[PDB]
Design a protein around this ligand. Structure first.
Ligand SMILES: *[C@@H]1O[C@H](CO)[C@@H](O)[C@H](O)[C@H]1NC(C)=O
Lengths: 49, 49
């Protein structure tokens, strides 16, 4: 498999042992953009600019 | 002759002639680890590197 990288901002989650267990691509969709803006993987009900 | 220096943080691998002083722990000491200069106290770390 062959892919190509692009300049994208990411939100990486570090666990207690310092290993990346989850990540969020900010430009993938509006929900991920909201997660990036709030700097949290969990977003409560509401409206976010 | 133009000497171009690139000053990164972690990978140094190039240091001028200096004497490696013995390790001192559990007291306020100004350490210098490959340029990382700062006052602090040394303690055993149990995190998974
Ligand atoms: C971190 O490492 C310790 C070592 O035993 C392990 O018990 C723990 O489950 C690990 N935590 C992770 C992988 O999130």
């Amino acid at each position: 498999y062959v892919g190509y990288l692009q300049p994208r901002t990411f939100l990486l989650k570090y666990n207690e042992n310092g290993t990346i267990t989850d990540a969020v691509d900010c430009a993938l969709d509006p929900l991920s953009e909201t997660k990036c803006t709030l700097k949290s993987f969990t977003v409560e009900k509401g409206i976010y600019q | 002759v133009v000497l171009s220096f690139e000053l990164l943080h972690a990978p140094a691998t190039v240091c001028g002639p200096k004497k490696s002083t013995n390790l001192v722990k559990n007291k306020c000491v100004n350490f210098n680890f490959n340029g990382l200069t700062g006052t602090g106290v040394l303690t055993e770390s149990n995190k998974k590197f």
